[PDB]
Amino acid sequence: PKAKTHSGASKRFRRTGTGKIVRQKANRRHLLEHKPSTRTRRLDGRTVVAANDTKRVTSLLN
Amino acid sequence: ARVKRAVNAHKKRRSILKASRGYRGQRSRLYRKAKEQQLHSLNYAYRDRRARKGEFRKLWIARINAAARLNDITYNRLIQGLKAAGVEVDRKNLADIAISDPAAFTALVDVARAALPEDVNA
Amino acid sequence: KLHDLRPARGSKIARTRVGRGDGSKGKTAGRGTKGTRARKQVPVTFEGGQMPIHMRLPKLKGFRNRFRTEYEIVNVGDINRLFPQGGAVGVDDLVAKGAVRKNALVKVLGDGKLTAKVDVSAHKFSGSARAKITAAGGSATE
Amino acid sequence: LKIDVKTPAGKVDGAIELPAELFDVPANIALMHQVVTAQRAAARQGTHSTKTRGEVSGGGRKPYRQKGTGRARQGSTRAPQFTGGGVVHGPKPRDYSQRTPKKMIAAALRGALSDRARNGRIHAITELVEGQNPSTKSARAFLASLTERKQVLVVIGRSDEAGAKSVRNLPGVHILAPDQLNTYDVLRADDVVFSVEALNAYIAANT
RNA sequence: CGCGGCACAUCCACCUUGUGGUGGGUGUGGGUAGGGGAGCGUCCCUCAUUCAGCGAAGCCACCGGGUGACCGGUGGUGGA
RNA sequence: AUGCCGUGGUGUAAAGCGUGGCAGUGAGACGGCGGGGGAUAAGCUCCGUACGUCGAAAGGGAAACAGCCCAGAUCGCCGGC
RNA sequence: UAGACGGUGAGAGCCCGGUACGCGAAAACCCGGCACCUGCCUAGUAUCAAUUCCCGAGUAGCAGCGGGCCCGUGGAAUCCGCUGUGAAUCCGCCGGGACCACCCGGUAAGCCUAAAUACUCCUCGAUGACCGAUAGCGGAUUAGUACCGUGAGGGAAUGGUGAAAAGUACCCCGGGAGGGGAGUGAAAGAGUACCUGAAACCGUGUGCCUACAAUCCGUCAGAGCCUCCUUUUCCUCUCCGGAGGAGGGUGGUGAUGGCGUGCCUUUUGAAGAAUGAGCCUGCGAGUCAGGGACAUGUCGCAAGGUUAACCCGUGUGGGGUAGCCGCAGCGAAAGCGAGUCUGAAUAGGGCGACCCACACGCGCAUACGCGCGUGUGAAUAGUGGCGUGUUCUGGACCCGAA
């Protein structure tokens, strides 16, 4: 009757200035002590979602 | 608009059961059985169109062979002569002139004899 | 008349009634198995049992400022191509000419040199905006 | 672009012109077709309704325990495979008119009127009367002489003199009002007989 | 392979040198789940026209036709 | 040896890649070669193989015959190789 | 002003009932109209320091446990319950999402209050791209009936002669039913087993075949036998047509030969000794709702598109500019803006802004073409409706438990 946006996946996904959905590359939350800085500037940012996770994510964003 | 699907169905029903007359059993009678048989009849007739091409060829071959061996030549050598002589007749009309004209067929056999090389070497 | 009325060839597409004989779309209508999909429909969330891409990724950082002062912008270069003469404009004149919606607080952006002699009234000018509009002869306002 | 037609006990008066939106708006029969389809659909009362199971009476009993009968597991005497049982995917009381745009509707209308003026089939008239007493004798005379066609539209207006009171009972002749003027009716109608008040206020409201 | 008859795809010469059609050359036309495209038949509403107590539908039979769904003709029945 | 990656040339029709809509499939079988587990076993079980076929492929051969060999059916022919 | 609708032996504006329109009433109920009856005020309203009292109590608050709210006790205010404790009366309390100070809004612990709102047992009026006897109400037919159950409860089936009954007088076979003839009727090829009359199913007759022979019950090749149809040797009675027939054509049937392992579902695999189906006729499964999400085909208009509820009208027609989306992005956000975020830095980078075969004039060039707007006329976009596919929330393809 009026479509629900999946909440949990709109609080984790972000439609950018154009048709890109940017997830958060963040196995970067719990244990950051053994992890070299390299593997954190590897896990610090917002990654455009790949193809094989898009058709569903957008239907989670709607 | 509730449609009352009778007429639409009775069309193909009458189709099957008029193209199914002359069936021994519950096959000219009933519809589903007439349909099972229609599928089998038309695969049979399909297979028999090809099959009959090949089968008439084998029959003509039997006949040409019989008239050949009446002329002391085998069918193999008859064909090899009618090839080397080149008379582009085919087994059908060859068998027809075999039946009606023993004369024309024996002319053909002498043609084939005159067009065999020498031997079983070549 | 009405006996001479047809759509454009390209619309009015044939509906696909599926379970209508094994010649078009036959028995299974497209769900061609005995699986789960063959009777019902698995959601977009469920992924097999492993945490879906909406449970294993982290919620996006930061909050949403409840008091986000959202504006509506109008383009200084496109305010040139809105008013070729100009001379006198102002937010009401923008919504009048149809440059931005009503019920608004306006910013004026700064793409393109505004080469029209214009004075603009609109809240919250940007750097390049005030620069260009005050170099086009006219000035900025509030 | 330019016409006007007579009065009973007269021959000619007026001889007026018409705006651009009545003649040279190109007839685009695709738009007209969609809009008249949406009108047809607006017409439908949409009162088909059948009892799906769950509305069917009774049948909340599972006869014939699952196993041990030799029958089929049935679950309800109102299963759609039964008789009297429910309808599946059946007609329910839909209410279906499409919500077309204002521009599309009006543009279809003025395209149809453009066609009518393009053939010369619009017949603007002063009053379709004998003057005060609604009489269908003279009104049929003046229409079947004013038109010569079979189907007629007559845009009189909210005045009864002999317009939307007397030319009724004439098959082929349907009566409208200068504002409920629409597409399906100008198309269904061959001639479009106006009344100068109707025509002028129509022009004046469309501008 | 020959000889005929359909169909699809690319390609040119073309008609209005993209729509849609003429000619051709080449390739192609097993098919399940499934995907696309094109279609038959039932019934209801409108516009157009048309047949009908001289006989509508329905039914039955025969004779034809379409590449398929299926279509038409004719007679019998019937009586809107 | 093969296979794999690249480049260079010739040949080849949709084959490729990117991006969408719509699916299905995710019980495979045997057969050839290469191997594991079996017992130097299985119509065994599990793998590899730009290997095949059945799956989903009819026709001919194999007596009969899903998987073997020949061959991939657009329809017709009482024509040929 | 009547061509609505329905009936009359067919399809009726003019035969009938009616309609359009107009009349229409005692009494009733009710709309409402005037007079009577009742309900007030015999100035403290103003301005006044403010001398004082009052402004709804086991209530508000606070703590405990819960409910409820988007708010799952979380940090939660506001509100509501139960238990303790338990206030003030305006310089009081209450709220403004803990709380505090200032600033605002209002005065809870009395009660009352039309409208727009939903609703349908009921009567009137109407309509339908609603069904038309397996449908549509379970219920057209004695219907919640008959029957089922102790009971709560469940719960059917069953319509059609004909225009008019003119419903077959009369004889005949029969004990009757039933028929035959007669007659009614346009039709009995409408007989109270009745409109039309399907198929399965059950017979009667007739052409073929079949009692030495296996064979998913057919197909192909095929002799013959019967068929109607016919060209002719023919009879020249052709001034009228077919006989035993020859050529020929469809149609029964088919002696005989070869080929051939039913349909479905499901399966690596089925003719399968796997499932399901005795047969025929009727019914049984992918629908629709939503200014839904996605993609696309088509169509409006154009940096726009569009209205929602609602207001006017009677054909779905005209108003309705709230809102929604498009118009600028970035960032946690403050913010900033064709930039924005990180950072110390733009160095990078992440996200987003921008496109010619040449100009105008120049930076420079080895033939180079990167640069700017004005153009040579640089290049396009959405939004709304309609079909389509998929998806969402709805039983949502139907059927089926324990």
For chain D, the domains span: 1-207
Candidates D120, D138, D116, D121; CA nearest to D129 is D138
Residue A46 and residue A40 in contact, taking contact as beta carbons nearer than 8 Å: no
Residue A1 burial class via C-beta count within 10 angstroms: exposed 0-12, middle 13-18, buried 19 and up: exposed
Residue B82 and residue B111 in contact, taking contact as beta carbons nearer than 8 Å: yes
Residue D153 and residue D198 in contact, taking contact as beta carbons nearer than 8 Å: no
Candidates C95, C101, C127, C132; CA nearest to C115 is C132
Residue by residue, DSSP assigns D168-192 as: TT-TTEEEE-SSS--HHHHHH-SEE
Candidates A7, A12, A21, A16; CA nearest to A55 is A21
Domain span at residue B12 reads 1-122
Question: What is the CA D84 to C1' G134 distance in angstroms?
Answer: 8
CB contact under 8 A, C44 and A56: yes
CB contact under 8 A, D29 and C2: no
Contacts with C4 from chain D: Cβ below 8 Å: 29
Measured CA to CA in angstroms, residue C64 lies from A18, A34, C67 at distances of: 21, 33, 9
Phi, psi for D187 (deg, rounded to 5): -75, -45
Question: Half-sphere exposure (CA, 13 Å, Cβ side) for B108?
Answer: 31
Strand D122-123, strand D152-155: pairing: unpaired
Residue D33 and residue D105 in contact, taking contact as beta carbons nearer than 8 Å: no
Element (H, E) at B32: helix B31-70
Strand C72-74, strand A22-24: pairing: unpaired
CA distance A36 to chain C (A): 20
Checking each nucleotide's C1' against the CA of A16, the nearest proves to be G351
Measured CA to CA in angstroms, residue C8 lies from A50, B34, D30, D61 at distances of: 39, 45, 6, 53
Question: Half-sphere exposure (CA, 13 Å, Cβ side) for C47?
Answer: 12
* CB of C59 lies under 7 Å from some atom of strand G: no
Residue keyed to tokens 């389809």 = D37
Calpha distance B48→D149 (Å, rounded): 66
Calpha distance D145→D149 (Å, rounded): 9
Residue keyed to tokens 């008379």 = B87
Does C10 contact D at CB distance below 8 Å? no
Domain count, chain B: 1
Q: State the chains in contact with D (3 or more Cβ–Cβ pairs under 8 Å).
A: C
User: One-letter amino acid identity for D36?
Assistant: V
User: One-letter amino acid identity for D63?
Assistant: P
Candidates B43, B6, B13, B11; CA nearest to B30 is B13
DSSP A51: G
Helices B75-84 and B31-70 cross at an angle (nearest 10°) of 80
CB contact under 8 A, C54 and A8: yes
Question: What is the CA C112 to C1' G368 distance in angstroms?
Answer: 30
Calpha distance D3→B111 (Å, rounded): 98
